[PDB]
């Protein structure tokens, strides 16, 4: 990793699976899907035209997905109607799914503390999301982004070399 | 690979096969054929004069082969006569067999989608190949080419050293 | 160049011109245009927002320009009508202006020799371009191309750093 060895990053566990996936007939309905995060160090051996032909890029979530993740990760919480779901996605532009989830995690974590502290009503208010807004961080940097969408348009050139 | 180790790229699986292929008599009709893509890192031990004597170079496909690959990879498809087989090879000059195949793959893939979409006639038209023409890429670069045909004329010098 | 020095590639002839071009008022009609071929080693000092704001990329010539260059570089030659201007641009896809010009230069050079040799009629025939077709070379490689169109979409990131 990172620097790497003197040769290719091949393995006796990679060759045996890439050979196994070639014995199957084309008419079987089995579908294998691979996932990675650093597509520059994987061997082109599995990227050969006939094992991994189609390459699909997953970009950053857009507005329609950002609003959906928030309506999904709190489906079992009594969130009040005072908050606005689209508004959060309106500020959130350069955040990934981990950031969008951890914002809601922080908001729920602070709300659940004041809920118990008031015992010495149990609903999430707008300020609860507001505190989580300011403590937001960026899971990914900027330089790696353009690295990712420079492999998207020019990727067939890496096959074979 | 790539950089390589401190010594030669020899192996106990290479020496045992190069020794095995020397025990056979010359009058047997068994013929062994090797194939590689980076003929600068293989040991000259198997390239000795008496195991791998003749060296044969495979250049890029020419016009006559480019037209043939297209007439071969779609032999089981109802392609209409509106398209021209020679015309595609006329534009395609600096593409390899993988590119020539993936062009037809893309054209068939887009045609098969509109065929189903029209259900809400099943033949490949000229525009179907036209879209695949623009999304063409180059499997190989340019610098590696002259690398390949500089080993073709001067190769006996690498034997023994 | 190439490797470069330990610091920036600044000069007392670059600073004095970039300072001089800032003294002029915006209402003057003087327009300065710069041209380069390796836009990764020039200082961002002249690329500051207010001296060189707009960045314009010159891609490879397309079909409409390839046919035009041929109709332009032989405007003073008695070329016969047997040849086809669009046909040459139909084969020529991955060639730059220097290659397109040198093809015509070679064709004219071989025609002018047989014109004198026949003295022991003076028009360019199809075979004259045909010989020049086979001796064609590529002025630019492939790896530098994707290098050029990877700076085109992501260029504002290089400003300031
Ligand atoms: C708990 C949860 C965590 C999480 C994370 C994460 N970094 O933890 C990343 C992506 C989705 C995630 N989800 C998630 N989980 C689900 C859904 C959903 N929304 C749609 C979606 C998913 C991925 C992409 C776009 C949009 N998101 C949809 O309902 C079922 C489960
Ligand atoms: C599906 C197919 C894929 C493919 C590929 C590839 N990169 O996937 C490369 C070369 C030939 C290929 N073929 C192919 N397959 C066949 C033929 C044929 N044409 C003649 C030829 C072959 C190699 C060379 C020149 C010309 N081409 C001939 O009929 C039988 C099978
Ligand atoms: C002799 C000549 C050489 C040359 C070269 C070269 N590497 O020597 C490169 C580009 C244009 C060139 N020309 C050239 N010269 C001219 C024209 C023209 N065609 C239009 C054009 C120009 C640049 C770009 C696209 C298309 N091309 C147009 O008429 C006047 C002079």
Curated annotation (Swiss-Prot), chains A, B, C:
What domain of life? Eukaryota
Task: Give the Phosphoserine positions (modified residues).
Answer: 115
Question: Post-translation: what modifications?
Answer: Phosphorylated by tyrosine kinases in response to T-cell antigen receptor activation. Phosphorylated in mitotic cells.
In this chain, where does the modification N6-acetyllysine occur?
A: 81, 147
Residue numbers bearing the N6-succinyllysine modification: 81
Q: Where in the cell is it found?
A: Cytoplasm, Cytosol; Endoplasmic reticulum; Nucleus; Cytoplasm, Stress granule
Q: Which family does it belong to?
A: Belongs to the AAA ATPase family.
Free-text comment on this protein's domains from its UniProt entry: The PIM (PUB-interaction motif) motif mediates interaction with the PUB domain of RNF31.
The disorder this protein is implicated in is: Inclusion body myopathy with early-onset Paget disease with or without frontotemporal dementia 1: An autosomal dominant disease characterized by disabling muscle weakness clinically resembling to limb girdle muscular dystrophy, osteolytic bone lesions consistent with Paget disease, and premature frontotemporal dementia. Clinical features show incomplete penetrance. Frontotemporal dementia and/or amyotrophic lateral sclerosis 6: A neurodegenerative disorder characterized by frontotemporal dementia and/or amyotrophic lateral sclerosis in affected individuals. There is high intrafamilial variation. Frontotemporal dementia (FTD) is characterized by frontal and temporal lobe atrophy associated with neuronal loss, gliosis, and dementia. Patients exhibit progressive changes in social, behavioral, and/or language function.
**Assembly, per entry:** Homohexamer. Forms a ring-shaped particle of 12.5 nm diameter, that displays 6-fold radial symmetry. Part of a ternary complex containing STX5A, NSFL1C and VCP. NSFL1C forms a homotrimer that binds to one end of a VCP homohexamer. The complex binds to membranes enriched in phosphatidylethanolamine-containing lipids and promotes Golgi membrane fusion. Binds to a heterodimer of NPLOC4 and UFD1, binding to this heterodimer inhibits Golgi-membrane fusion. Interaction with VCIP135 leads to dissociation of the complex via ATP hydrolysis by VCP.
Q: What does this protein do?
A: Necessary for the fragmentation of Golgi stacks during mitosis and for their reassembly after mitosis. Involved in the formation of the transitional endoplasmic reticulum (tER). The transfer of membranes from the endoplasmic reticulum to the Golgi apparatus occurs via 50-70 nm transition vesicles which derive from part-rough, part-smooth transitional elements of the endoplasmic reticulum (tER). Vesicle budding from the tER is an ATP-dependent process.
Instruction: Supply the name of the protein.
Output: Transitional endoplasmic reticulum ATPase
């Amino acid at each position: 990793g990172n620097i790497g060895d003197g040769g290719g990053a091949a393995d006796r566990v990679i060759n045996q699976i890439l050979t196994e996936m070639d014995g199957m007939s084309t008419k079987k309905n089995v579908f294998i899907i691979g996932a990675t995060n650093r597509p520059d160090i994987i061997d082109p051996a599995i990227l050969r035209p006939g094992r991994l032909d189609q390459l699909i890029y997953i970009p950053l979530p857009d507005e329609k997905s950002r609003v959906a993740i928030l309506k999904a990760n709190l489906r079992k919480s009594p969130v009040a109607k005072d908050v606005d779901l689209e508004f959060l996605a309106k500020m959130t532009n350069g955040f990934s799914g981990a950031d969008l989830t951890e914002i809601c995690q922080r908001a729920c974590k602070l709300a659940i503390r004041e809920s118990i502290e008031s015992e010495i009503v149990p609903e999430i208010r707008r300020d609860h999301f507001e505190e989580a807004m300011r403590f937001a961080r960026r899971s990914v940097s900027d330089n790696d982004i353009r690295k990712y969408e420079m492999f998207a348009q020019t990727l067939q050139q890496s096959r074979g070399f």
